[PDB]
Design a protein around this nucleic acid. Structure first.
Ligand code: MG
Ligand code: MG
Lengths: 504, 297, 500, 299
DNA sequence: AGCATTGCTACGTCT
DNA sequence: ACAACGACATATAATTAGTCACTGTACACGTAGAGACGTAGCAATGCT
DNA sequence: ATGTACAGTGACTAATTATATGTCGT
DNA sequence: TGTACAGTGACAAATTATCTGTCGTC
DNA sequence: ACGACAGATAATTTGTCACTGTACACTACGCCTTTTGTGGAGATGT
DNA sequence: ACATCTCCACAAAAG
């Protein structure tokens, strides 16, 4: 096929300058002198101009421009040593072994001596032998991915099913990451970085909701982001918003990684209740729609804040802990200004015309119904199975409970819903006609007065048995009423609770 | 002596302003044309907003020497059919010399008022601009070929200039392979090959036949400013540029797309983005710092 | 001031050759007539040629070439916006904040909207203005240090005092590095990377000893390195070494990282008992005589071993725990062979004349005395401000003890010395004439059928008391004998005292 | 014509074999000089193993133009007073630029050699292995002036060779400062300024008055190979190169080291390091790999 | 009577 | 004398400032902290 | 056929403006 | 005056690809 | 004419050695979550 | 005198 000349050197231009003069139509009675008047400006004998015009016809402008020797890029050490060098480097870089060329050359020295070869290759040759191999091993780091284009989109489930994302809320996507800001207690001492959870519309590419907090990735954290995302948004004048986060409604599907919180029974039961299927990505690359807003946050927000910790151990600022001053309530109040007034108002990078919110508000088949928030909560509550037993008692995590109709159902298993933040008021459900029906609120007897969280109810039960104490409602209460007798997890939870309690 | 000996190349600037597909005012295009000496035949043309540098003439050479394929949208009566390698060429940088050399014809570079006299100079926006550049391409090839070329010549009016040229060819006009005439094309350079052999061009995306072997490498492109729907990709070497494959435009909504249309698509896409108010996106920036200004360790 | 012309172009050569063609002297009336050839040669009037002569006769080749313009590197946005940009970027990047040129441009646009500026700097203008700052702070990142040259050297100390290094054993150094090799127990689960602690002779750049083991950086580790460094060497025929690690004898100084074991009491006791002075390192760079051999040894050894772990988390190769395959009884042999048959014979990097080994043997001030092994094993850890009982008996860390000659003394302040790896017995010392003098060796009450270590007895005391057991040496011993560290310690149990 | 009017360059290849300052054979030098074609006296002169080339010619031209001096070990009874540019320099493109800079005509395309070659060099024990290029300095630069130029030819006015020179001026040259024509010196294209203004060159280290401000930047050197104990540091501009600092070699035993001696000194370090009996040292590498290959994986 | 010594627990602080 | 540096007003052109379409590249849980050895809180188990 | 998409880049182009030129000048 | 080894620039020595002669009939 | 003999000559790789950029500055297999089959009572029914 | 179910507590993989 076509070979095009380019970057002609000036002596090749001189070759062109004669060729463009010989291009005047000529005959033997004219070629000889019109050649010779060129040979004098080539300053070389006629026969070279004959070979020049020969090669010009044979190959064109790339015929008159010289081609590198057949030997270029081919070594003279020969086939044995070319292999042995490359063999030795190749075996030295599989597994975690990282044998560099110098160690290869030191092997080559050993090999020649034991081979009785008196002329081992020099280290410069060995480095030149591997230079193309090293470059091929380098290039693999750079190969770019085209990405999806235009409106049409699908997401690659590990089931192998490409779920089309035909409209807004059709697939929401969720993941967590460690924020790159060291936070502080309100007293100013260092609190280790929070986790951020994001829920994202895959069409529209709005961020739909977040949860920011010190709690590790957990189904209660997932459920907390889901609550914020699904519910309408309201923010007070302490959030100085100019935009408004006008997005709500349920997803039709929910697309995740394989984290144990996402693969939890709790979440799959929320999906069955609210009405979406839970799908897992094959690999993080397929997650890019949600992995990327982190970097747009990392660059445009977290990096510009006091106590940015740097995206890597090789990159943490030399005084991140010295500069650390933002609290969880303060970082959230900024992050919400970023999302409402900025990120969701930016163009969708596939579309250019539409801001991420306008690609939402316009892309809904119908305006979602305003969900009753108690119903959302009730189907966010995790649940367990127990049987009503004698006297209408039922056990759940060492506590005992009863409610206004329980004892009639003694002898069979019931479904009951519990919130780990306050287990003291269980909601219990019968199954009848193979349908779920609510019975009553089962109250923890003697504890129908103030809230008890599940985590201490576990931890107390573990350690209280070292006292040999009987475990009961009153003894776990007696193990709770004096917990005022400070440490990181206390700092985090008290700060983390202290953010949300302004809601009204 | 004979017709088809010396080929003239002429330029003008068309005093008709045009409007874009979305209503933007276009400029006034330059017209470049390749004509015989001894016939008045027209054998090559290019028209556009590119200045009459070496570009528009290098394309107008390519226009003439290849077989004159034509589209139904032109509503042509006549086959133009004017293939043939020239042998002398005459024009008002040096690049024309390299083409002339490589194609083996002497370039010895230093009548459009027929269309000024014709009603061509009275279409809307001549001298409401309700016409566009693709409409000129379709009509002007017709109004030249079917009317200004096929008609009787102004003097030596015994022959139409096409037929005076057609019989006068010293033998028969000989077409030559397409792919050897890539030097006449436009050039774009140091494009990078993405996974699976993919390329971006004019905000569009492209893919090649065997180009996936050179993902992560870099390559050059050549094209016609008349249909970028498939553009030629070549691997760069130290003094050789070797043709590798065609690459095909993907996701476009039409079977054909001129370069001007990719400019217009981008310009509409760009001009939409320019109208979005940053007022919220901006005021949050100073307010974030005014908050952080309260920080002390 | 001398200035020389550079990048002499073709057009400058054209301009130069005509200048040289008129450098040939002649009468001024023909001079002003032969220069007329320049007119079409330069396509300009002779008045420019007169100007060119006025330049060249004034300025030579430098003024014959065209200058850069007066506005090169000057930004037409003016001093307000160029100040504003460099102010905003530098304050935005103070401390841990890391603003970027794109973030600066948003500030510029914001302030312009406040100012009602009709035409504020474009982002690429803002990016251009910062390019000098980025480059100047980049070059400040990578400046090479010359390093010492020749035989003369002195080492800066955290005291501020600078201490010359004059002969071999004048100043030893140590630090610990975490080895980049995952290596495994018998049959072999992954365990974890060990620590390497090395003694380096600052004169010879030689290396007299190492301790390799899973033990954290601790005074028992440093002491066991010095126990290796100071003694004569004998390695078994199972190593099949070609060279003998003939470096022994004692330092006049020990210059070291300021690690808590290097700052420990125990080592200071060794300093008094062996006569070296401990000196602290000011900053890490001053340690380079021992910092760098970790780099050298990582590159030339650990990187070739199966369990290699890379130089950082961000470079950590994922197969390390998939095929870690050495045990420390092999990694010892690899490291010891590398030192004794290669590194000892390697050339000293700035002498060239001789190996690392010969700059030790030829450089020491005189042949040192080879001490009795038992004397360093009398340089045990010691405890003080304790008291002897009014009887033939003693106590230590809730152990209870007997002693042959203690009954001649009433209850009084006592000093005692112990092997932490064999706390079965103690050596007891008295302050006679204000000098330490031996009382007796001593033993735990009735303990002879078995031997005990200090670390396991300390751990046993925790489980002893928390169960409410009656505290005694009898019960404490049971809580010793009634796991990661167990695997690690039982690997370290493999020792040359069973093999020499 | 005049003693500053017309100077002609000449060259010769010496018929003596040299040993370094330790005792190994080097080569037979090249030798080059310029002679005033008016006075016919041997003035600026260069000797060394670098073969005649525009750099060597330009270096000998500096040796002519610059006022000559001798060290305290010579204090010689005879000396050159030669200095200044000629009106024409003869050596019959780089030599055009020096002439265009200094303003003298450059021409390029009776000689004295036998007065040294046959009369002296053939008499030395090392004539064409036991004298050194430090010694072959005075064994030329003395005799060339203390005998040859001090000789008289009645062919040219019956005066000593240099008396015709210093008599024969239409206007007596002024001396030129050393700083005015570094263009004759050697060149180093890139050097990196190390911390504290230190710079490595010829395996030595250099420091100078203002060079530390350029630490982490790149500078150019120019130097005189007859003694590298000073080097000149230059900073390149857009299209100019400005004299930055002088610099001085740290840690020398004697403040006279020539480029030839620094090479031969560094060749001691190279030969010493290369003397290692490394073949017994290779056993570590092959047996380390054999051990690791003896460890098969657990699964 | 008196303390007096003995064996843990921070709270750093450093590598 | 007239070939030397001014006095222009006007080009000439090389600077900066701005527009765009490309592309590399990190987003993928991860260092705050393990693990030594004090100075200083402590209890205790003795005893005179 | 299609991970994501923003910050930084390159390759020009419009505007600025530093200063080279040609003629007269004394 | 941290340390100092693996990688790299500029060059000479050696190899050897191929292109330049004087030529012979075409 | 072209191209065809033996040998020149511009590459090409092999090998030296002064120079410099960089890591050594100890600092990942560890924190945290979820499922889950095995196991110990201990009220209750048979 | 017995058998039964139920509620609560511990080792392996993924982010
Ligand atoms: Mg995730
Ligand atoms: Mg250390």
């Amino acid at each position: 096929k076509n070979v095009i000349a380019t970057q002609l050197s000036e002596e090749a231009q001189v070759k062109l300058e004669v060729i463009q003069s010989l291009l005047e139509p000529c005959d033997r009675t004219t070629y000889g002198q019109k050649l010779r008047e060129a040979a004098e400006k080539l300053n070389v004998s006629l026969r070279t101009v004959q070979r020049l015009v020969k090669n010009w016809e044979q190959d064109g402008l790339v015929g008159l421009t010289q081609t590198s020797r057949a030997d270029k890029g081919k070594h003279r050490i020969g086939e044995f040593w070319e292999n042995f060098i490359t063999k030795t480097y190749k075996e030295g870089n599989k597994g975690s072994k990282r044998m560099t060329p110098k160690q290869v050359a030191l092997r080559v020295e050993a090999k020649a001596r034991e081979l009785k070869d008196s002329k081992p290759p020099n280290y410069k040759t060995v480095l030149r032998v591997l230079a193309p191999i090293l470059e091929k091993q380098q290039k693999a780091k750079s190969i770019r991915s085209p990405g999806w284009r235009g409106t049409t989109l699908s997401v690659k489930t590990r089931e192998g099913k490409d779920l089309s994302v035909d409209y807004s809320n059709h697939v929401w996507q969720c993941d967590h990451t460690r924020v790159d800001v060291l936070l502080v207690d309100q007293h100013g001492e260092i609190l280790s970085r929070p986790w951020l959870t994001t829920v994202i519309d895959t069409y529209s590419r709005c961020i739909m909701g977040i949860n920011l907090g010190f709690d590790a990735p957990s189904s209660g954290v997932v459920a907390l982001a889901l609550r914020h995302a699904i519910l309408p948004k309201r923010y007070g004048s302490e959030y100085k918003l100019h935009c408004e986060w006008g997005t709500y409604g349920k997803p039709e599907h929910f697309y995740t990684d394989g984290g144990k919180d996402f693969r939890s029974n709790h979440l799959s039961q929320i999906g069955a209740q609210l009405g979406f299927v839970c799908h897992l990505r094959d690999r993080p690359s397929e997650g890019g729609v949600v992995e990327r807003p982190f970097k747009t946050l990392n660059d445009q927000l977290f990096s510009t804040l006091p106590g940015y910790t740097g995206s890597n151990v090789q990159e943490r600022p030399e005084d991140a802990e010295k500069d650390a001053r933002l609290t969880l309530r303060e970082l959230e109040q900024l992050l919400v200004r970023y999302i409402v007034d900025r990120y969701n108002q930016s163009i969708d990078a596939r579309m250019g015309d539409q801001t991420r919110f306008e690609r939402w508000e316009a892309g809904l088949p119908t305006v979602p119904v305003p969900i009753p928030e108690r119903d959302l909560d009730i189907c966010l509550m995790k649940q367990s199975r127990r049987t009503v037993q004698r006297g209408g008692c039922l056990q759940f995590q060492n506590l005992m409970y009863r409610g206004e109709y329980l004892a009639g159902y003694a002898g069979e298993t019931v479904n009951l819903r519990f919130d780990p933040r306050d287990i003291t008021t269980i909601l219990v459900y019968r199954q009848e006609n193979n349908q779920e029906v609510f019975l009553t609120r089962a109250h923890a007897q003697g504890l129908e007065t103030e809230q008890l969280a599940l985590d201490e109810a576990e931890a107390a039960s573990r350690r209280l048995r070292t006292a040999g104490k009987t475990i009961s409602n009153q003894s776990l209460l007696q193990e709770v009423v004096d917990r005022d007798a400070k440490e990181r997890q206390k700092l985090e939870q008290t700060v983390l609770r202290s953010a949300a309690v302004d809601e009204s | 002596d004979y017709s088809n000996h010396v080929w003239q190349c002429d330029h003008t600037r068309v005093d008709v302003l045009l409007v874009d597909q979305h209503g933007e005012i276009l400029s006034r295009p330059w017209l470049t044309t390749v004509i015989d000496t001894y016939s008045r035949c027209i054998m090559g043309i290019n028209l556009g907003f590119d200045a009459p540098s070496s570009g528009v003439v290098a394309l107008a050479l390519r226009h003439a020497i290849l077989p004159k394929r034509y589209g139904s949208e032109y509503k042509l009566h006549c086959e133009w059919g004017t293939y043939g390698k020239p042998e002398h060429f005459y024009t008002d940088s040096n690049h024309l010399s390299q083409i002339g050399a490589q194609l083996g014809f002497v370039c010895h570079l230093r009548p459009f008022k027929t269309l000024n006299d014709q009603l061509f100079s009275t279409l809307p926006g001549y001298t409401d601009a309700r016409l566009t550049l693709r409409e000129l391409e379709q009509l002007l090839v017709r109004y030249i070929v079917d009317r200004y070329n096929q008609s009787i010549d102004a003097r030596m009016g015994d022959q139409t200039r096409f037929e005076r040229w057609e019989a006068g060819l010293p033998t028969v006009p000989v077409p030559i392979p397409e792919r050897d005439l890539d030097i006449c094309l436009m050039k774009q350079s140091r494009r990078t090959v993405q996974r699976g052999g993919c390329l971006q061009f004019q905000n569009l995306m492209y893919r090649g036949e065997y180009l996936a072997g050179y993902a992560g490498e870099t390559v050059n492109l050549r094209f016609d400013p008349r249909d970028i729907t498939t553009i030629l990709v070549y691997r760069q070497e130290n003094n050789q540029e070797v043709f590798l494959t065609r690459a095909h435009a993907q996701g476009l909504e039409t079977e054909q797309l001129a370069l001007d249309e990719a400019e217009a698509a981008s310009r509409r896409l760009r001009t939409a983005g320019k109208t979005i108010s940053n007022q919220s996106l901006l005021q949050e920036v100073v307010d974030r710092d005014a908050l952080v200004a309260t920080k002390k360790s």
